[PDB]
Ligand binder design. Structure first.
Ligand code: NA
Ligand code: NA
Ligand code: NA
Ligand code: NA
Length: 1043
RNA sequence: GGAAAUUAGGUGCGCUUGGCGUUUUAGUACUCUGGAAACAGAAUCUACUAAAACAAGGCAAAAUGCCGUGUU
DNA sequence: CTACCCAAGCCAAGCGCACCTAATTTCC
DNA sequence: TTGGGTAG
């Protein structure tokens, strides 16, 4: 039939509501669910990618230093340098002789940790933060008379350690020390100047941001030109043309001419500047003064400033005129007419200055110009600052209309329109459905991008199954992400705690239990300092408590135009003032005779109220002092745009995409958005359950409410004015009072259909991506007990943190797990003493150090033992793991990584018994065009699971795939335990965590299913994006993945 | 609403580095044994320093070498 | 099996371009 | 939230 589509677009969900356009009965409703596309995910990938390069290039630096030492025959395979201490050698080499083994180990150590380059220049007063800027400053002061190696050696002898936060130095300080060392060791070893040059180079050299990665990288570029051209944007009017450099000469001339052509001069002659005038202006004030002032242009044209209007202006109110940057930058170093009067050359100098990023490359590229530039000039030009960014137009666009700017008075947009040049757009005439490719182009957040792409796919599926709707109404989340969302929640709860405490304070003080029924009026009362804002008369709290009906909550701006139901549009006033005011603004009401006070007296009170701590809302101030005319349509448009509709950038982009698609394919579909604040008002007034603990269906419930709102706006003729604005159609009945407003929207008994609806559908996005995180980073050592079991060795760090009770619980439950319990028991007894004395304290080690200022030290008869900074203890028995012991030679024990991230599991039915094979991310291998499962790993896993050749493959299960275990349908999380045949699932219509909360069940909030001989049946289900269920069938395990 | 410009603020993608962190091994300290000491042996607990590995792995051949946790 | 338990790499410094917001001038 | 070992 004819239907209205409502969309609730969220961070992790897209809820849709389908309701009849006439009957207002719900056809269908559901939720599309997916993971939040938060920026930290890709940040993690980029961060790891950067870390790999750092480690790779650091290693490559060392190898080259060693390869250099090999070539000069200071190092051999046979040469042994193990006992040597670099800090001792590096200091000794500064004034004495070193062995070929002792000298090289000093050079190698320097090459490994070479310090920073960029931080160097600027000192920072020490706020005692562990900042690089602060630390570098602190070391420089302490490096005044000493070299780096010297200072480190002193710290080593004096403090016992070198490494840490302090070990941050400038690269120059290392190089300075290296140079001195090489100068002294120069006499004792046969080295040429090529040696000392190559090493210093190797020590200090690092890639630049514009140089990028090496030759192979898909992230790299061939040269600086290709690098910049890829990044820079394209012209608005010529898409094929690259933008001009922001400060090209012709670009700024274009800017200056637009300024002059926008001017209006009041005089007997023409009000617009003639060509000869603009020529004189450009030459006599623009090419003469760096920052042209209004006076200079006025003096040139022989009028006063007051006669000149229509000029760009700064926030101070001072005129802003285009600065000819290149012209003056070059003029200052050279006044030769050969250079300055050459626009083309000035253009080329600007481009070179902007594209390339260092003086040296600038010089070379400037030299390649074969201009009339003196080399002395070129070197001077290369140090010019501020050549960054692009103009929004190409030189092609700029040069084309430059004469027109000179000889007409039309600005750029007037000329472009006259020339029939339209800003580039994307055609959707060919598209069979609403495209998803365009989303990134107009989006800022990764979170919003995914939500939009999913939203579009939801729409495309709905129109395919249901046909086109007349109306699409959309609401977006207030939060940009979940972290931001949680912050909103915290502030909400905190405010609630404050108000709830305030109410308790009143019932204890007055004994009037009525206060819990007057929260909003009390909130207003406290916020308004106990005065009626319209009469400025005092509102005694006792009278408010006893007779609350005498004091009315009035809406500042009438909701007939404001559509604002929030606390910001509410004021507690006397019933008499609220009655007299009617459908007016405070300004309109207080201007009339009906009012007790003048608007000025009112304005004064509000302004003082709006300043200071606990002040009135800023939005409230803007409302209370609204002096525009409410009946003016333009003003009504502003309020609708602020409070009734969603005019945020992301919303506009998506909405325009939909409208553009429909208009081009000539589809009569009306698209609109709605402010979340207004829908919340509806849900509140339509008496929906306050506590949203029903699970995912709330998203579909919201979309139905959103769809119902669209229905209401198309039902009434008084809402036709507002409906028109929401649908953005070009251009009367209207809501006249507060009471009328309530009648139209507060209709709780007309939406029972929504609440009674119980046919919600759910769609969970399935993840099948290969090569995600393969395994946890942490390296673990192992031990073998007397029983023969290999045990994981864990570390206890942060023993002196306040809230760290890990050690206390460990000793009370299992002291024998401490390796220190078996070896060095003297220290254990020393620890146990500390533990027993502060048993009540969460961390006995914290309170100790807090009181003594000293840490637990290893036992020594001389009381000179070392501090204990972390304690090893035995963990669980080793099982599922990654053996990487081979990376560590002659290691007495196994070295492992843990948590083998599963890709999927394949269920087999083997002789009436269900079993499954766990496919790890480690088992999926990449090829140039595709991923494939390791057959040797799969068969091995098949054998370890005792799967037989007779067994038949049932299905594969990825994350969020639907599974029916013994007749109950769940969604797959993943393999929880391969060895114990335990897979983890969750509920489809709700989280299992919340399900237990509703039941007040204290069981662990995780569903673990065991696939064993007691398992009766396993089926694989799936859904469309709308949440419609269906069963699947397959014959063999997919071993090839395309990516 | 759209076009250009000026200032301030913000978001993302990409690049370039720093010092940590985990682990092994070696040396030293610490503990234990013998000894007048030197020193040797044991232990590998705690600490410091150096060398090496750090998503499994895949390329690549003197290289400011390259890829491997994102999206679809 | 149920009902537990544990533990999971991290900060700081540059840079390019794209995009957005707010304010100001003109015009379409 | 999730790999996965543990007590009973
Ligand atoms: Na480009
Ligand atoms: Na620049
Ligand atoms: Na009055
Ligand atoms: Na940025």
């Amino acid at each position: 039939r004819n239907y209205i589509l409502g969309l609730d677009i969220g961070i992790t969900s897209v809820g849709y509501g389908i309701i009849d356009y006439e009957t207002r009965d719900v056809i269908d409703a559901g939720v599309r669910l997916f993971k939040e596309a938060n920026v930290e995910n890709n940040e993690g990938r980029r961060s790891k990618r950067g870390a790999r390069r750092l480690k790779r290039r650091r290693r490559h630096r060392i190898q080259r230093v060693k390869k250099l030492l090999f070539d000069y025959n200071l190092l051999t395979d046979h040469s042994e340098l193990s006992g040597i201490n670099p800090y001792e050698a590096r200091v000794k080499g500064l004034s004495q002789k070193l062995s070929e083994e002792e000298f090289s180990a000093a050079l190698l150590h320097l090459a490994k940790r070479r310090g920073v380059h960029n931080v160097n220049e600027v000192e920072e007063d020490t706020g005692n933060e562990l900042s690089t800027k602060e630390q570098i400053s602190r070391n420089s002061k302490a490096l005044e008379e000493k070299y780096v190696a010297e200072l480190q050696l002193e710290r080593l002898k004096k403090d016992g350690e070198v490494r840490g936060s302090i070990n941050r130095f400038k690269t120059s300080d290392y190089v300075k020390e290296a140079k001195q060392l090489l100068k002294v060791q120069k006499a004792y070893h046969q080295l040429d100047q090529s040696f000392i040059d190559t090493y210093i180079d190797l020590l200090e050299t690092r890639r630049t941001y514009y140089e990028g990665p090496g030759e192979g990288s898909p992230f790299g570029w061939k040269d600086i030109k290709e690098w910049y051209e890829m990044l820079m944007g394209h012209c608005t009017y010529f898409p094929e043309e690259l933008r001009s450099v922001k400060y090209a000469y012709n670009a700024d001339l274009y800017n200056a001419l637009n300024d002059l052509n926008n001017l209006v001069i009041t005089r007997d002659e023409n009000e617009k500047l003639e060509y000869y005038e603009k020529f004189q202006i450009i030459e006599n004030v623009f090419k003469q003064k760096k920052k042209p002032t209004l006076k200079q242009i006025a003096k040139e044209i022989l009028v006063n400033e007051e006669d000149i209007k229509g000029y760009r202006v700064t926030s101070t109110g001072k005129p802003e005129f285009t600065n000819l940057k290149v012209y003056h930058d070059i003029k200052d170093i050279t006044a030769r007419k050969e250079i300055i009067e050459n626009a083309e050359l000035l253009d080329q100098i600007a481009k070179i200055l902007t594209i390339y990023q260092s003086s040296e490359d600038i010089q070379e590229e400037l030299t390649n110009l074969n201009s009339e530039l003196t080399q002395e000039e070129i070197e001077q030009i290369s140090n010019l600052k501020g050549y960054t960014g692009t103009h929004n137009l190409s030189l092609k666009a700029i040069n084309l209309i430059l004469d027109e700017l000179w000889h007409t008075n039309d600005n750029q947009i007037a000329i472009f329109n006259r020339l029939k040049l339209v800003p580039k757009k994307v055609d959707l005439s060919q598209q069979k459905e609403i495209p998803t490719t365009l989303v990134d182009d107009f989006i800022l957040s990764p979170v919003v991008k995914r939500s939009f792409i999913q939203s579009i796919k939801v729409i495309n599926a709905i129109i395919k199954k249901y046909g086109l709707p007349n109306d699409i109404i959309i609401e977006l989340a207030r939060e940009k992400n979940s972290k931001d969302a949680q912050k909103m929640i915290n502030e909400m709860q905190k405010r609630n705690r404050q108000t709830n405490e305030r109410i308790e304070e009143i019932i204890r003080t007055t004994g009037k239990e009525n206060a819990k029924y007057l929260i909003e009026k009390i909130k207003l009362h406290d916020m308004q300092e106990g005065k009626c804002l319209y009469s400025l008369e005092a509102i005694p709290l006792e009278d408010l408590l006893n007779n609350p009906f005498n004091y009315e909550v009035d809406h500042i701006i009438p909701r007939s135009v404001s559509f604002d139901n929030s606390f910001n549009n509410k004021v507690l006033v006397k019933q008499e003032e609220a009655s007299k005011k009617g459908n007016r603004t405070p300004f309109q009401y207080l201007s009339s005779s009906d009012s007790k006070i003048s608007y000025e007296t009112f304005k004064k009170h509000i302004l003082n109220l709006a300043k200071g701590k606990g002040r009135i809302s800023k939005t409230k101030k803007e409302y209370l002092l609204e002096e525009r005319d409410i009946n003016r349509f333009s003003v009504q448009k502003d309020f609708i745009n602020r409070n009734l509709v969603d005019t945020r950038y992301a919303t506009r982009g998506l909405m325009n995409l939909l409208r553009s698609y429909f208009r081009v394919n000539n589809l009569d579909v009306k698209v609109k958005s709605i402010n979340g604040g207004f829908t919340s008002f509806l849900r509140r007034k339509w008496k929906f359950k306050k506590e949203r603990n029903k699970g995912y269906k709330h998203h579909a419930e919201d979309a139905l409410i959103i769809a119902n709102a669209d229905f209401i706006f198309k039902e009434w003729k008084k809402l036709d004015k507002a409906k028109k604005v929401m649908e953005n159609q070009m251009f009367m009945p209207e809501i006249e009072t507060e009471q009328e407003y309530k009648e139209i929207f507060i209709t709780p008994h007309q939406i029972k259909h929504i609440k009674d609806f119980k046919d919600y559908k759910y769609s969970h996005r399935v993840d099948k991506k290969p090569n995600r995180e393969l395994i946890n980073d942490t390296l673990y050592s192992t031990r073998k007990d007397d029983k023969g079991n290999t045990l994981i060795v864990n570390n206890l760090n942060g023993l002196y943190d306040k809230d760290n009770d890990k050690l206390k619980k460990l000793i009370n439950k299992s002291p024998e797990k401490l390796l220190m319990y078996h070896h060095d028991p003297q220290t254990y007894q020393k620890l146990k003493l500390i533990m027993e004395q502060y048993g009540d304290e969460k961390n006995p080690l914290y309170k100790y150090y807090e009181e003594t200022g000293n840490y637990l030290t290893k036992y020594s008869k001389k009381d000179n033992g070392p501090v204990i900074k972390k304690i090893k203890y035995y963990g669980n028995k080793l099982n599922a793991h990654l053996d990487i012991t081979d990376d560590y030679p002659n290691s007495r024990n196994k070295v492992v990584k843990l948590s083998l991230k599963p890709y999927r599991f394949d269920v087999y039915l083997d002789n009436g018994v269900y079993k499954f094979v766990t496919v790890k991310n480690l088992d999926v291998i990449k090829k140039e065009n595709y991923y494939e499962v390791n057959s040797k790993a799969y068969e091995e896993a098949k054998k370890l699971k005792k799967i037989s050749n007779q067994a038949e493959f049932i299905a594969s299960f990825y994350n969020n795939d639907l599974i029916k275990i013994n007749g109950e349908l769940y969604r797959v999380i993943g393999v929880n335990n391969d060895l114990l045949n335990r897979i983890e699932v969750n509920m489809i219509d709700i989280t299992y965590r919340e399900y237990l909360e509703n039941m007040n069940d204290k069981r662990p909030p995780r569903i673990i299913k065991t696939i064993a001989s007691k398992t009766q049946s396993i089926k694989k289900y799936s859904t469309d994006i709308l949440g419609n269920l269906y069963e699947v069938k397959s014959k063999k395990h997919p071993q090839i993945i395309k990516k």
